[PDB]
Design a protein around this ligand. Structure first.
Ligand SMILES: [Mg+2]
Ligand SMILES: [Zn+2]
Lengths: 350, 225, 453, 124, 94
RNA sequence: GAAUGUUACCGCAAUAGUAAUUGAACUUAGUACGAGAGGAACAGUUCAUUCGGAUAAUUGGUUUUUGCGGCUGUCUGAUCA
RNA sequence: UGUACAACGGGGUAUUGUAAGCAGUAGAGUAGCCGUUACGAUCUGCUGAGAUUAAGCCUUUGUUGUCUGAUUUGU
């Protein structure tokens, strides 16, 4: 009979870092343009979407169905550097790293720990080398062109722009899908300090996989028949695959929550706000199902590492309405207008 | 006109469809084999509306109607009602009858001139059905069967009833309906003749289980030829 | 059971069956036992192995016995057919021998199990088990010939025909090479060799055809030679038994031509001597190969023999041929009519003063053209579109946008169905201004009524 | 959410009339260590007639559940349930013995059993 | 949509929220949340509950072309009803 | 917790473990095979039991909000809080 | 020494159910005279009010207070 879990997931010691490191990246298709392999963000909360589907041969074909969906915060991102790797018998080794020298205070805080007590002796000294006519970054580009057949770009999250006010941002590597590494490095150099749009990397109905750290539960350490004669739960990296993206959330403008059917002008911000989270005011991605971890936990979005031709991925969504009632209790209305209509005027109104 | 036809693997043709003299309903599920099978005999004379009722594939029994109109249960969703209104002919009317009973096809059976209703159906629903269909309404039961539509089948031509009906009951039903009546059987003696198949004044459809004598009896009573 | 008992498990020969049983016993039981093990455990293991082997043998024998058709009392016709095919006495004796062998195996297993529980030394238990296995093998060894014969008859019994004499049937019979096999092939949708020799259809092939909305089965048989009822072959004995037991008249064929080189006097004498088989069948006679003889142009002496055939009550002489099968329709019609007569002899609207109606078949259906599926020039039958689209697996049904409305733009317009308030369907009606024209007056008369100042 | 567990004394739902039935067995049950079968709405199960017609007593027949009475999450987000557990009796092919039904029937059971749907008037 | 209003409280019941319950009476019971469901299950008439809408109404508390044309109706009716409710509340204070 | 002169970030992997499992509704099918009885799977979709990774919007129990309003009796002299 | 931080109250959103008291003295009845007078359950307006105001939900260019205190490491 089965056992108390999967032996491949044991031992289950605590994760070495809150941020889930990417184990692998999708194969580099040279014929495709210079796109982005993955993205990083913080998940806000859960919501319910009611929609119909075009699924011929299914019992619920042409019938409206409600499925669990989640909203992940993903504000605009700016590239901070580029990293190249060379294949070796010991594996892929980092050749050299480059920086634009135009690093925001967020990455400086991330690098340091006691920023308030820190003297703020940032990269300025090294930047002074770059703050010239050049020929240094040109040398780095030449080195990464002659070698480093695989290039990974470095980006940092706009933690300051996140609804949950914070000063320290996360940093992680992201690969490219473009042609020969010449185009990759040229695009990376041109895109230094340039804003990155989430919608440019994903699209509706796209199948994606994500990695995150599950909720911790503290110490979790009876039958006296275990050994023959002849202690932690949660707070570990976990992966999930085959997640359908229903719609790209352009949360910097109204009408994102309402669909073409309901057109109930409002934002996806649940009444009162997300539990233990702020108020979304920037770009976000809508993905069905659920992702490990809790609110404010960093998550990574990847396109499954491979292309899928199954009809499930091909099928397109027909969102009719998105639920945004107050999750802080037994919510009954989507916007204050509905609550006022139901209850009418109140003492506070006069 | 009488051509053998089958569902995916079910002989209950009338459960998933309800043929009428001016329109036909078919479940959206399955495949177009049923749709094409009905089109072959029906050609393109009238629209064949692929539609669901309350999300179920039993639309044939849930709904009932005649040439002058179609009736649907209150359980039908707004989208389904809108689709039916925009797909059915202008002459056919639809309404959200607010009555306790749901299965119009099983609880009610009617033709272009005569309609049988449950003895306990509300007066308002009876009047609405009479106005919509342009037919007379009579309170009757087939040998004590509460589900008149589940056993009785009636068109402008002769009608068919399940074999358990007594001779006196058959004669009384024929006299009231003013149509020829024979206590035939379908689908190898199945008693669901009123709901397991569909038929009208020109077209008769039934499961493959219908033996050749049953097909001959159906043709003779309905006089398709 | 009845109707093609082929489901018998086609037992392997005695040697193969014994090898299979021994392999199963070895594989499904433990093998590694040592002297140091407790005597009780070793004895229990040996007893378990012996019991498993005995139970396997008993189950095999019981399944073999049960699978057989139970010839006794099954049916007189089937019983006689089986007796002719497999010499009933031998088959019964073989089954009795198998039952006796099973009983002996049971007794031996019980005796060895009883004795095995007393041996002290491991060697004693091993020797007792070996003796039990040898006894079982010796019992099985003598069963080789009955098992092989039963396997052969099963190989033959499985493919035997399956018909119920109690049902309505009409058969074809006559001299061999009269064209009877061709008549059987033509009359019913059955494939049988039509080679021109006197034993074409050695086996009693069964044909099925439908008439008057009822299924009518038929059988075939080469017939009977002179056969004075003392010297008959198995094939002819089967035909005689079938004719005796079977239901309503079997068609008697006669080749009135040069072929079938027996004088027509012999053909007449055959049916005259077989007359006792005509107790209540109301036999019918059909002349075959009429095309190349035209019995009308027959000698008076020969015609007298044909006339004598008509003398016996309840007979008819119908013309039939193989090159042209037009007569087969009339032959089958007459046979079915006689069969129905034999099977039978064994035993409103009310014009309620008010209803007026006409057949309401729509003019469209009345004037629309008949559909033809095989003709390439036909309607789309969007099932074909689905088939070319990849079937229902990927065919996205799109009957939407193809419904009757006022304008062609409404086909693609997405109905909102929601406007931040309860659905408009509750109040969705044409000319909405009826609920807006008076709203201005209502607002004016509510504002100027002193209720706000 | 599965319905009643094994042995539940469910009430009859046919027109013939029976006091109750005992679910001795289930078909397509999720056989698992420590997980007993639980017949859900619309599932055909073999339930003995604990009490009812004298001839029907002391024999097992395939019982088709028409009511669940428990909270189950349909694909529709509404967590609907029913007054009490009830189920009709029919042969393995769904041929209901009775000529009518008692009480309402759900869409989930009606869809899987066309005969039951034809045998019921108050659907949903 | 066909969103149903709770027959007890008259409040809207959005899809996925509340519970819809039916009995052998073939009547659909709709509740926006557990409180009203249990209140109805206890035979408590809504007129006995102050918060429910029915008591407020009884006691005098608060008394393509087609879609394009009806767009205006919803806002106008909502504003008129809100104004009427506010006026009623003004005289409610005494 | 000594690693590696100090600190923090990014990563590669030498190495240890490894998982999914089984069934069914259709399509092809009442076609090949079938005198009849009966009757497929090769492709694609769609569902289902157990188990593995996660939760937390919907649903049941578990309630230390002492949170709301109230009920039985006692107390600051019944009632104030 | 800056959207700096924590608290304050509000707003938004939810839990529950109409708060202490006042008055229309409206008022089932208790006690005096022999229908009436005093007390007054209860309803009604302040008041879908009050409280919780997640102790573990979001905001606060508005108010208050602080932006200081120790220690270790060298190619
Ligand atoms: Mg021959
Ligand atoms: Zn409610």
């Amino acid at each position: 009979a089965p056992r108390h879990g999967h032996l491949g997931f044991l031992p289950r010691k605590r994760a070495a870092s809150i941020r889930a490191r990417v184990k692998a990246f999708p194969k580099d298709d040279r014929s495709k343009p210079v796109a982005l392999t993955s993205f990083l963000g913080y998940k806000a909360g859960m919501t319910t979407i009611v929609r119909d589907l075009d699924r011929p041969g299914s019992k619920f074909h042409k019938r409206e169905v409600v499925e669990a969906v989640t909203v992940v915060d993903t504000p605009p991102v700016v590239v901070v550097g580029v990293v190249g790797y060379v294949e070796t018998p010991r594996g892929l080794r980092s050749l050299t790293t480059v920086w634009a020298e135009h690093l925001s205070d967020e990455v400086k805080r991330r690098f340091y720990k006691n920023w308030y007590k820190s003297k703020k002796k940032a990269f300025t000294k090294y930047s002074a080398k770059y703050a010239q006519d050049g020929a240094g970054i040109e040398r780095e580009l030449a080195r990464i062109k002659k070698y480093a057949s695989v290039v990974r770009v470095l980006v940092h999250t706009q933690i300051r722009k996140t609804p949950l006010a914070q000063k320290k941002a996360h940093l992680a590597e992201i690969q490219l899908n473009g042609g020969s590494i010449s185009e990759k490095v040229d695009w990376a150099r041109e895109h230094f300090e340039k804003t990155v749009a989430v919608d440019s990397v994903f699209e509706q109905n796209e199948m994606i996989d994500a990695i995150a750290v599950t909720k911790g539960h503290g110490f979790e350490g009876k039958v006296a028949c275990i050994g023959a004669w002849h202690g932690q739960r949660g707070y570990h990296s976990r992966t999930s695959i085959n997640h359908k993206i229903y719609r790209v959330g352009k949360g910097d403008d109204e009408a994102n929550g309402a669909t073409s059917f309901d057109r109930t002008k409002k934002t996806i911000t649940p009444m009162g706000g997300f539990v233990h989270y702020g108020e979304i005011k920037n770009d976000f991605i809508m993905v069905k199902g659920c992702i490990p971890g809790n609110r404010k936990r960093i998550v990574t979005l990847r396109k499954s590492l491979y292309t899928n031709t199954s009809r499930k991925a091909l099928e397109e969504v027909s969102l009719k309405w998105i639920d945004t009632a107050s999750k802080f209790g037994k919510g009954r209305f989507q916007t204050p207008a509905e609550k006022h209509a139901f209850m009418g005027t109140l003492k506070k109104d006069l | 006109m009488a051509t053998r036809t089958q569902f995916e693997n079910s002989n209950e043709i009338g459960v998933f469809s309800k043929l009428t003299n001016t329109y036909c309903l078919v479940a959206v599920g399955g495949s177009e084999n049923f749709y094409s099978a009905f089109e072959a005999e029906l050609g393109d004379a009238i629209p064949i509306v692929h539609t669901t009722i309350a999300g179920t594939r039993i639309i044939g029994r849930m709904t009932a109607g005649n040439r002058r109109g179609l009736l649907v249960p209150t359980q039908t969703t707004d989208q389904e009602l809108q689709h039916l209104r925009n797909s059915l002919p202008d002459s056919v009317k639809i309404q959200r009858v607010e009555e306790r009973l749901s299965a119009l096809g099983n609880v009610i059976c009617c033709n272009d001139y005569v309609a049988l209703v449950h003895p306990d159906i509300d007066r308002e629903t009876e009047e609405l059905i009479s106005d919509v269909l342009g037919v007379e309404v009579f309170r009757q039961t087939i040998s004590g069967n509460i589900l008149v539509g589940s056993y009785c089948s009636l068109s402008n031509q002769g009608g068919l009833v399940h074999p358990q009906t007594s001779v006196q009951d058959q004669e009384e039903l024929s006299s009231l309906l003013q149509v020829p009546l024979v206590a035939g059987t379908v689908n190898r003696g199945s008693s669901v003749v009123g709901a397991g198949m569909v038929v009208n004044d020109y077209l008769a459809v039934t499961g493959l289980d219908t033996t050749a004598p049953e097909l001959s009896v159906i043709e003779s009573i309905f006089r398709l030829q | 059971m009845q109707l093609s008992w082929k489901d018998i498990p086609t037992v392997a020969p005695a040697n193969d069956l014994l090898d299979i049983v021994l392999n199963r016993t070895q594989r499904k039981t433990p093998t590694v036992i040592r002297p140091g093990f407790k005597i009780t455990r070793i004895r229990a293991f040996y007893m378990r192995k012996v019991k498993y082997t005995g139970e396997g043998f008993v189950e095999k024998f019981e399944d073999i016995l049960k699978g057989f058709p139970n010839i006794n009392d099954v049916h007189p016709f089937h019983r006689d057919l089986m007796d002719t095919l497999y010499e009933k006495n031998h088959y019964k004796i073989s089954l009795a021998a198998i039952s006796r062998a099973k009983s002996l195996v049971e007794q031996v297993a019980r005796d060895y199990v009883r004795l095995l529980k007393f041996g002290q030394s491991l060697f004693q238990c091993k020797q007792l088990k070996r003796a039990a296995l040898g006894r079982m093998a010796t019992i099985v060894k003598k069963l080789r010939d009955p098992l092989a014969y039963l396997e052969q008859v099963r190989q033959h019994i499985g493919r035997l025909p399956s018909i119920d004499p109690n049902t309505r049937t009409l058969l074809i019979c006559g001299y061999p090479n009269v064209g009877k096999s061709s008549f059987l092939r033509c009359i019913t949708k059955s494939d049988v060799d039509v080679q021109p020799y006197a034993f074409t259809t050695k086996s009693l092939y069964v044909g099925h055809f439908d008439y008057k909305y009822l299924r009518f089965q038929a059988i075939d048989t080469p017939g009977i030679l002179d056969r004075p009822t003392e010297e008959m072959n198995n094939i002819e004995m089967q035909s005689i038994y079938a004719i005796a037991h079977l239901r309503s008249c079997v068609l008697y064929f006669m080749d009135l031509s040069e072929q079938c080189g027996f004088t027509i006097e012999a053909q007449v004498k055959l049916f005259h001597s077989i007359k006792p088989l005509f107790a209540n069948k109301s036999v019918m006679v059909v002349i075959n190969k009429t095309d190349i003889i035209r019995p009308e142009d027959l000698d008076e002496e020969r015609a007298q023999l044909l006339e004598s055939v008509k003398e016996v009550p309840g007979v008819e002489i119908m013309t039939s041929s193989c090159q042209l099968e037009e007569n087969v329709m009339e032959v089958r019609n007459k046979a079915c009519e006689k069969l129905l007569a034999s099977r039978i002899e064994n035993k409103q609207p009310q014009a309620r003063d008010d209803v007026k109606r006409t057949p309401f078949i729509p003019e469209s259906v009345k004037n629309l053209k008949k559909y033809d599926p095989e003709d390439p020039n036909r309607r789309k039958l969007a099932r074909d579109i689905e088939a070319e689209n990849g079937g229902a697996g990927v065919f996205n049904v799109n009957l939407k946008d193809k419904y009757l409305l006022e304008d062609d733009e409404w086909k693609n317009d997405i109905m909102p169905e929601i406007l931040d308030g309860k659905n408009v369907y509750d109040f969705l009606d044409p000319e909405i201004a009826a609920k807006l024209q008076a709203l201005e007056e209502e607002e004016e008369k509510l504002e100027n009524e002193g209720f706000y100042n | 959410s599965l319905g009643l567990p094994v042995g539940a004394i469910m009430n009859c739902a046919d027109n013939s009339g029976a006091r109750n039935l005992y679910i001795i067995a289930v078909k397509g049950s999720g056989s698992r260590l420590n997980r007993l079968p639980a017949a859900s709405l619309g599932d055909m199960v073999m339930a003995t007639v604990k009490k009812g017609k004298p001839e029907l007593r002391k024999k097992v027949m395939p019982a088709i559940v028409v009511r669940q009475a428990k909270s189950w999450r349909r694909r529709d987000g509404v967590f609907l349930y029913f007054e009490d557990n009830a189920g009709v009796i029919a042969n393995p092919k769904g041929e209901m013995k009775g000529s009518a039904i008692t009480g309402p029937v759900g869409k989930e059971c009606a869809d899987l059993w066309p005969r039951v749907a034809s045998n019921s008037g108050v659907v949903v | 949509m066909r969103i149903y209003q709770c027959h007890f409280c008259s409040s809207p019941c959005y899809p996925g929220h509340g519970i819809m319950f039916v009995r052998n009476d073939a009547k659909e019971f709709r509740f926006c949340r557990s409180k009203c469901h249990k209140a109805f299950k206890q035979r408590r008439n809504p007129r006995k509950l102050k918060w429910t809408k029915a008591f407020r109404k009884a006691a005098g508390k608060e008394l393509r072309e087609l879609v394009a044309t009806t767009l205006k109706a919803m806002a106008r009716i909502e504003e008129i009803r809100q104004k009427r409710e506010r006026a009623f509340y003004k005289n409610r204070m005494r």
